[model samples]
Target chain A: ASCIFCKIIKGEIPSFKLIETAKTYSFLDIQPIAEAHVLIIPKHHGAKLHNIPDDYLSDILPVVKKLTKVLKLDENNTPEGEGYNVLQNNGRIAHQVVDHVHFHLIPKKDEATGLGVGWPAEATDFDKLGKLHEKLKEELAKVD
Target chain B: SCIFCKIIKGEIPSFKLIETAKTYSFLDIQPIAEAHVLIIPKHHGAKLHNIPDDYLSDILPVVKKLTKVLKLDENNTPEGEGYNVLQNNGRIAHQVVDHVHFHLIPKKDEATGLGVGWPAEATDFDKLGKLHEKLKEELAKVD
Candidate 1:
């Protein structure tokens, strides 16, 4: 497979390396939506989030824990009032431009600073919502 | 200035439409990343997980509902094959924009997918087996 990210890992592409671990790579996004925008790409790329194995998914939180300290996205730098956002796009309708599975680390200071979102919320058609909720619940039950 | 979040709250000018008690949605500015999805909480704060559990319970379910409605899943459509759910915490780690939100990235292939590099460690199967058994025992205790 001719994966550009794989090439990057193999030193084929030029990227400003941020963090490198056993299974993930952190780098500054060349086309950043915000300043200091960073991308965390898993070494074992999957087509979708769910497609990635659960064990691998579990490993991610540990990486994030390390990253929190490395990036200082904690109470010290951001303080009590400051904030940030972590974004992962999946498919086109949901606005996923890149096919490579990666997460976006977006920083926000107030109500408005980064990407804008809009939703057309309709009154809870209770009859419909309740049934759907149950279906989801059933799905969750089968996960274990 | 012109913040999309404040605009969602009707505090500024925006192409407003729908909003829940906890979350508000709007448009994207330089959507270099495609669909460039965005979802934010109504109240002002940082850290996505730090959101009040009640608000989180409300907001997350809504986001899941939106994903279903948008068909942003492999089960939905062929073109909309895959999706990635992401949330970031701070700046030194590359959180450029400071807002508490989540991004559901769509996946088409290995390249556009959330690129991850895993250096798999050789696991001691026997050790893993014992650990799994121990964990099950602990779980039963909690119940």
Candidate 2:
């Protein structure tokens, strides 16, 4: 297959392999942003998160949660400690390099290494936000 | 008690939205965008790695279902609509709450929401290959 992740899964290409669950595969990122920048992905080939089935989606985070424990990413279970990020990018504009759906478990150990995110929050418009809330709530009910 | 736990307990009022047996979703009071929502598990844990497997299973499905409501799943294209699924674990990671939660931050345009600076590094195949074998042994007991 042309998909790079598929090749890695198939063992056609070498990877720093980690975990392989029933529906997921994990490996160290070839170009890591941190010490243990791991990529956890659904075995089912899908371009985006919505493209995958709920079964596959449901199985992923558990794998990620387990990996964090093995990696010792939790900082003594405290508010002020070193941490991690479960980051998933969708679409090209969203900085997705691969079409295959993948979640990055990045260890934010320090200010220099790991994922650096600049959160520039917008001015709140409660009127618009509240209106959008009502609309989304109605739509969500229809989904379940 | 944790602030989010207080919010979950209905002690602190929140702009709550979605609810499940093991999870709860609410609108972020100080949102970066119009529909910035926080999804948290009912059982409390400080880090992503500490949550139970049963609780972890509900997360992405909830996130996916919300995308339908947010209209972020209108198409399969790589350019049209975009959003981020972010879960931070500790203080250095910029996590405000001690409770484990996932943030669904919609990126409508470049000027708002999550602005990420991924400073990636070149891989050393030798070190990686060496560490690769060690991780297998280290993670062998991760059940």
Candidate 3:
């Protein structure tokens, strides 16, 4: 009852409902970053992305994809298309406001609106990447 | 073939990590952090809306497994070191490639990668209610 999203799923708190399915609920973000800005969340509540069950996590993107199709957020008229961002934050520094696993589908037609990010990406470090790749390969082996 | 498809097919050279039937992962050439990784669907889908449901379903587990392998959430707390599952759709969305991929950036510190300027705006529930009604109607019409 303390969670706003859980309440929305329960119909206790009013929401701008867009789509509801067996495992997911999507609604328009009242304070939006851009037009058609939507938030898709799993019925199973969790504070972070990794905290949710895999089955509940599986239910998310399809709901997000369905929402994009209906919204025409994927209409790629230009090379850029009328696009969107699928953003999920896991921590406070990562810009996660709420303690739930939710994905943001925010429309971005231009730089002025939607999700504006500063890449400031550093140059490639192949030597370092090579070592990390080896480590990740081992990790993947152990994981599977 | 798209660059990612080629990389998956062994045509393009990539720092290979994981390869499942439905998904493939590799190291990003650009270092947002040393542990930066990418995961993608085996099929070719330019955007989220194009990918199939089963393909979509196969994604997050790979993401979760990677997080554990990379040990991103050792703290096991939301306020601790975290990551962002960032995927872009179109040009304005900063999607440089035509293939869909997910960036798993490990945000370990302040001077790290994937800096964001989320310009969140206030909302009007009246406008939202109206828009909501129209969107509900649209969702009903579409598959």
Candidate 4:
């Protein structure tokens, strides 16, 4: 099925274009959490975050660094310093609105503008937590 | 506002839970995007580099595993695309949802995660190209 992002990539939908190359592209989010909310996407789509190729993953961050400068979300302007947020939603339960994979670069003065968070931290039972970490490590070995 | 670091300190309530002694995971309320997930250290307020190297090393693999398990960027969305991984510091750029967290956004069909915009004019491509070379040289030097 042709997705909305696919349409955007094909120029079917109008967007405030940022950066475009052969494999990756960046643009503005219409329902932006903050002004200058930008997204960086690869031309090739993947289902989940982990499944992405390492080369593609490595390529994306440098582009993000560039975006930070372009938006002026740095130490001079931002309240907590020229800071920014890079967000990615995985599933519906966690808040995956769009099916396509993309990264959110929302500039923040505080939590007022674009991004907000709720962190319900649980007390760590070191013994149990350690075991879980071990199990997760084992699982990671199988990924590639 | 309830800052993210305080929440990780057991001062706030979160919708979802993925906890460990040295680490914590939680769901984002008022998520800027969907399936927005967070992973943090038991300690409070550490910048990316300041975080213990081992924590950094192990934390990412955990995130990777989560993405796989969650299927954040599976084929049903963008047939053959990938995902975006992001981390930010301070509040100049876009650290609204404070408390240091890594974002593993799935990149499916298009530029939905952050959306698209106009790139700054690169009036001096050759100058920038040389600068890129210089930066790479410095990076390689450090390596």
**lDDT (Cα, tens digit) per residue for candidate 2, span B14-79:** 777878899999999788877999999998988876788899999888888888878888868888
Q: How does candidate 1 fare on TM-score?
A: 0.53
lDDT of 3 by residue, A92-122 (tens): 8888888878899988877888998666566
Q: List model 4 lDDT by residue over A1-144, tens digit each.
A: 466776788889765567666666787666666556678876666544555555555456556655655554432432355455676655443356566667777765554565654332334444544454455445445644
Give me the chain B TM-score of candidate 4.
0.65
**Each model's TM-score, in the order given?**
0.53, 0.95, 0.95, 0.56
Lowest lDDT sum, 10 consecutive residues, model 1 chain A, at A115-124
Clashes of each: 56, 0, 1, 52
- Indicate whether candidate 1 or candidate 3 has the larger lDDT: 3
Q: Which residue segments of model 1 deviate by more than 4 Å?
A: A76-80, A110-113, A141-144, B1-78, B81-143
What is the Cα-based lDDT of residue B67 in candidate 4? 65
Residues A30-63 of candidate 2 have per-residue lDDT tens digits of 8999888899999999988888899999999988
- Which sequence of candidate numbers ranks them by DockQ, best first? 2, 3, 4, 1
TM-score of chain A of each: 0.80, 0.93, 0.92, 0.86
Decreasing TM-score order of the candidates: 2, 3, 4, 1
Report residue B138 deviation for candidate 1 (angstroms). Answer: 39
- Clash pairs detected, candidate 2: none
Go through the candidates in order and give the C-alpha RMSD of each one to the true structure. 13.9, 1.5, 1.5, 10.2
